[PDB]
Amino acid sequence: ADLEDNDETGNDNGKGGEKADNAAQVKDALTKMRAAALDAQKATPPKLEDKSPDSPEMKDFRHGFDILVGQIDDALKLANEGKVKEAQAAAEQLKTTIRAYNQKYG
Numbered sequence: 001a002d003l004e005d006n007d008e009t010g011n012d013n014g015k016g017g018e019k020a021d022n023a024a025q026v027k028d029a030l031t032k033m034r035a036a037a038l039d040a041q042k043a044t045p046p047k048l049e050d051k052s053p054d055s056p057e058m059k060d061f062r063h064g065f066d067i068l069v070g071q072i073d074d075a076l077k078l079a080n081e082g083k084v085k086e087a088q089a090a091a092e093q094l095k096t097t098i099r100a101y102n103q104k105y106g
Contacts, residue, residue: 022084026087027076030072030075034069037072041061047106048061051105057105060101063101064105068098068101075090
């Protein structure tokens with residue numbers, strides 16, 4: 001029932017001071033992957049050097065990105081209501097998860 005949450009000014013720009021050490025460093029680290037998922041998808045031909053939308057590419061992409069983009073969100077929400085220590089750890093569980101996707105197609 002809110003009416004003040006749509007790219008106003010408090011969001012996104014809610015930094016530029018608390019530098020990058022705890023949660024700040026995390027957040028920036030979460031979008032890092034995100035922006036990467038979108039990149040790989042259709043920007044910097046990675047493992048798809050010769051696996052165009054023929055093989056499970058799309059299945060692994062449409063998902064592989066949903067996954068990352070699914071954990072990325074599961075990550076912040078963790079650091080949102082669960083100290084970074086729990087998130088930084090939750091960040092690792094991802095490294096392995098994507099490695100199944102990264103290696104699967106790697």
